[PDB]
């Protein structure tokens, strides 16, 4: 019944999350929304068959339509290569998508109060704003075979050159070059401070700028400049603040504080710290990850946990399973809230917010999948994969009426 | 003096409140018990400034010569410090310089006091972090590049053979870094990790991002598995230990979920960051041991690895009362003295180190502790002052002998 005027780009995934994803469309999306989906299959078999062109097409379609929702995908190793007879070890589609879209990936716990915390002190959400571009994720790394000289060079388009000796190696080893871009750093600042202001919480940036004075100094300097120039008035008025901290200070502080801030993280730290944050609030499966592009026009919401292989086997052998589908639901729901914002579609916005509260309310009612049941204690019953979704469905009609 | 110590210990003096503490430790806990020769290097910032930081290189070389260093926390200058002490320049991290000379692994482990609550109740057994001490971010070359152009990295063999890779066609201004590691440092990292795991009788884990940095991180992964297969698999299987590689993002969530009880070998940067998380999760950054062991296993640098407690230094400067935890500083001395005793076959010195460590722990567990720890127990548990606490440790040490 809810009419959606513009398309949403859908990136299909792998194994058990692919099955869950289809359950979600069949029960929670199509029966409630009149919705055009521009469909890309990022299953590993389609990526293989297309030599990974589908991933480029998908990223470009996201940039074109403004909204993408993405199902979890497996990242190949050697054994994945065997099992699927693949042409090679495909790199995660996520790296490619991030490289094209840029921006910031906002990660935050989906808090269900009956799920026990591993860090009891965390009583407010932590939001990690992971810089989505560069550093290790687009680096050039290689082995050097023995004694010799390593150097790095930049040549301007007008001939202007910088070149430095990096190491007089006394033996064989490994080297890497990585980079980032002032304009992407700038947009990382803007989105982090925009997200802070909007959530009404302070913003922290972690760096190692005492060691990487030029590289991490650039993040530190751009953040303070963007903050001073574009946000400090609004922050003062909302009684918020911005602070830069050394990464090793910030991570200890995060463990100890109660939460209630946006933590802007360089790509690598956002990758690693996001998982600690998620796990601390109680589960890798209870997190949103929403990439927001530099312009503010473009969003890609992802599930972002494993594709639950154990379960997929059981399901293939037509056995029963209970796979948590909450992170997948919230990929849809984060994508559709942005589709609503772009279209001015008040009924789609309310639909998103409502299905989000339903998920949290169902779990807090005592209706959840095995993985969550098991965290609560040995006695908590659980529903099956489709049993869980039917309950959400049932609650959602009730909520919507 | 009374226990005779045959060979000298190299002493690295530090900054601010830690320098004050360090001196009370030498006067009250060391000189009265031990006939000890100290080979003294002042790495106070003003002395680094007078010697153009030569004193730091000299200290590190003297530790290599004599086998044992003990190191007070020091300032790493930022712009604030340059202006505050009117430094000639922003001298680099003295720990960076020391570690680059000595190589090896820095073993870090919480100092466990039963009456001090953890932030992570699931952590029932100690986590040991073995942080690779060489290379990567801590000996990198980084710089800004001012506009569009091409970035490349290059290796020229000593024999003249040349590897060269384009890294990025930049579209505008940015930052770049190169970093490296050495197969022989990686090999010795592995061997020191497995050896420590064997000695403490716990399993060993390595974390990398080898799926992203296939050559660089793949190299750590390959060497550890090879060293493990050839030199440790049998001994580990005999002791019911194991070795596993995990992706850093997997390891970090596992670590939070598990009980502890293992040696976690981290690359330089991840050991820097994760070992502060672990220290904080068990109680305090002041309840952490930090002992660098060189690749040949013959040399040790034990340090107080926390800041210099400027905030308390200020109070002490205007004769106000302070309560500064001196335990990590005591343990730098005791860990060094234990290695000195091992080199010298001095059983009386080894007993003395053991006894002082146990006195720190029994003292805190008695209910006698500084403000930082008292506050972990409850808003109203009482604390001793800086010297109140050191006088109590002293008394407990007299009795202990």
- Residues of B within 8 A of A225 (CB-CB) are none
Helix, strand, or coil (residue B28): helix
Residue A386: alpha-carbon gap to chain centroid:
25
What contacts A362, CB < 8 A, 6 or more positions away? A368, A388, A391, A392, A395
Helix, strand, or coil (residue A357): helix
Q: Which residue of A has its CA nearest to B144?
A: A214
Kindly report the CATH number that applies to the domain delimited by B1-400. Answer: 3.40.718.10
Could A152 and B248 be called an inter-chain contact, meaning their C-beta atoms sit closer than 8 Å?
no
Helix intervals (H) in A92-181? 93-101
Contact (Cβ atoms closer than 8 angstroms) between residue B113 and residue B364 = yes
Contact (Cβ atoms closer than 8 angstroms) between residue B52 and residue B24 = no
Could B184 and A171 be called an inter-chain contact, meaning their C-beta atoms sit closer than 8 Å?
yes
Render A241-282 in DSSP notation, one character per residue. Answer: -EEEEEHHHHHHHHHHS---EEEEE-HHHHHHHHHHHHHHHT
Task: Return the half-sphere exposure (C-beta side, CA atoms, 13 A cut-off) of residue B89.
Answer: 6
- Measured between its terminal Cα atoms, the distance across chain A in Å is 12
**Nearest to residue B88, comparing CAs of B40, B47, B43?**
B47
Q: Which residue of A has its CA nearest to B185?
A: A173
- Measured CA to CA, the distance from residue B132 to residue B279 in angstroms comes to 17
**Residue A83 backbone dihedrals phi, psi, to 5 degrees:** -55, -35
Q: Does B225 touch chain A (CB under 8 A)?
A: no
- Residues of B within 8 A of A249 (CB-CB) are 276
Identity of the residue in A166, A176, A182 whose CB atom sits nearest the CB atom of B174:
A182
CA distances from A191 to A138, A188, B227 (A): 21, 5, 46
Kindly report the CATH number that applies to the domain delimited by A1-401. Answer: 3.40.718.10
**Nearest to residue B78, comparing CAs of A172, A213, A133?**
A213
Give the H/E segment covering residue A165. strand A161-169
Residue owning tokens 């202990």 = B400
The sign of the torsion formed by the CA atoms of A49, A51, A54, A57 equals negative
Could B279 and A75 be called an inter-chain contact, meaning their C-beta atoms sit closer than 8 Å?
no
Report strand pairing: B149-157 vs A148-156.
Answer: antiparallel
What contacts A401, CB < 8 A, 6 or more positions away? none
- Residues of B within 8 A of A247 (CB-CB) are 272-273
Contact (Cβ atoms closer than 8 angstroms) between residue B261 and residue B269 = no
Tokens of B305: 């690895």
Could A252 and B119 be called an inter-chain contact, meaning their C-beta atoms sit closer than 8 Å?
no
- Measured CA to CA, the distance from residue B397 to residue B363 in angstroms comes to 10
Look up residue A27 and give its DSSP letter.
Answer: I
Rounded to a whole number of angstroms, the distance from the CA of A387 to the nearest CA of chain B is: 28
Could B154 and A151 be called an inter-chain contact, meaning their C-beta atoms sit closer than 8 Å?
yes
Render B56-115 in DSSP notation, one character per residue. Answer: HHHHHHHHHHHSEEEE-------HHHHHHHT-SS----HHHHHHHHH-SEEEEEE---TT
Which of 244-273 (A) contact B at CB < 8 A? 247-249, 251-252, 255-256, 268-269, 271-273
Rounded to a whole number of angstroms, the distance from the CA of A21 to the nearest CA of chain B is: 24
Domain boundaries, chain B: 1-400
Q: Kindly provide the resolution of this structure in angstroms, with one decimal.
A: 2.2
Look up residue A4 and give its DSSP letter.
Answer: P
B97 marked among binding-site residues = yes
Q: Which residue of A has its CA nearest to B119?
A: A119
Work out the number of other CB atoms within 10 angstroms of the CB of residue A120: 13
Could A141 and B273 be called an inter-chain contact, meaning their C-beta atoms sit closer than 8 Å?
no
Could B155 and A147 be called an inter-chain contact, meaning their C-beta atoms sit closer than 8 Å?
no
Could A152 and B152 be called an inter-chain contact, meaning their C-beta atoms sit closer than 8 Å?
yes
Q: Does B122 touch chain A (CB under 8 A)?
A: yes
Could B157 and A177 be called an inter-chain contact, meaning their C-beta atoms sit closer than 8 Å?
no
- Measured CA to CA, the distance from residue A141 to residue A382 in angstroms comes to 46
- Measured CA to CA, the distance from residue B174 to residue B146 in angstroms comes to 7
């Amino acid at each position: 019944k809810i009419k959606v005027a513009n398309p949403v780009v859908e990136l299909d995934g792998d194994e058990m999350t692919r099955i869950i994803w289809q359950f979600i469309k069949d029960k929670l999306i199509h029966p409630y929304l009149d919705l055009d989906l521009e469909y890309y299959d990022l299953g590993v078999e389609n990526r293989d068959a297309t030599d990974d062109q589908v991933t480029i097409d998908a990223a470009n379609a996201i940039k074109k339509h403004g909204v993408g929702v993405k199902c979890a995908t497996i990242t190949p190793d050697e054994g994945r290569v065997e099992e699927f007879k693949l042409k090679k070890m495909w790199k995660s589609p996520n790296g490619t998508i991030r490289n094209i879209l840029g921006g910031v990936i906002f990660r935050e716990p989906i808090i269900c109060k009956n799920v026990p915390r591993l860090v009891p002190g965390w009583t407010k959400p932590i939001i990690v704003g992971r810089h989505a571009f560069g550093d290790q994720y687009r680096a050039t790394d290689f082995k050097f075979p023995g004694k010799g000289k390593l150097s790095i060079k930049f040549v301007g388009e007008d001939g202007q050159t910088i070149e430095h000796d990096v190491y007089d190696a006394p033996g064989a080893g490994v080297a890497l070059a990585m980079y980032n871009l002032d304009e992407s750093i700038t947009e990382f600042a803007r989105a982090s401070f925009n997200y802070g202001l909007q959530r009404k919480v302070p913003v922290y940036l972690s760096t190692k700028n005492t060691i990487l004075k030029a590289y991490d100094g650039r993040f530190k300097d751009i953040f303070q400049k963007v903050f001073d120039e574009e946000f400090a008035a609004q922050f003062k008025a909302e009684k918020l603040w911005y602070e830069h901290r050394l990464i090793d200070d910030m991570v200890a502080s995060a463990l100890k504080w109660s939460g209630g801030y946006v933590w802007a993280c360089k790509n690598y730290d956002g990758d690693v710290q996001s998982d600690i944050v998620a796990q601390g609030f109680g589960s890798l499966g209870l997190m949103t990850s929403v990439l927001m592009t530099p312009d503010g026009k473009t969003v890609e919401a992802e599930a972002a946990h494993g594709t639950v292989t154990r379960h997929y086997r059981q399901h293939q052998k037509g056995e029963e399973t209970s796979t948590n589908s909450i992170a997948s639901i919230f990929a849809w729901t984060r994508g559709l809230a942005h589709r609503a914002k772009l279209d001015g579609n008040a009924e789609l916005a309310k639909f998103s917010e409502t299905l989000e509260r339903v998920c949290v309310d169902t779990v807090e009612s005592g209706f959840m999948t095995k993985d969550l049941a098991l965290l609560i204690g040995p006695d908590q019953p659980w529903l099956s994969t489709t049993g869980f979704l039917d309950k959400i469905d049932e609650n959602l009609r009730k909520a919507m009426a």
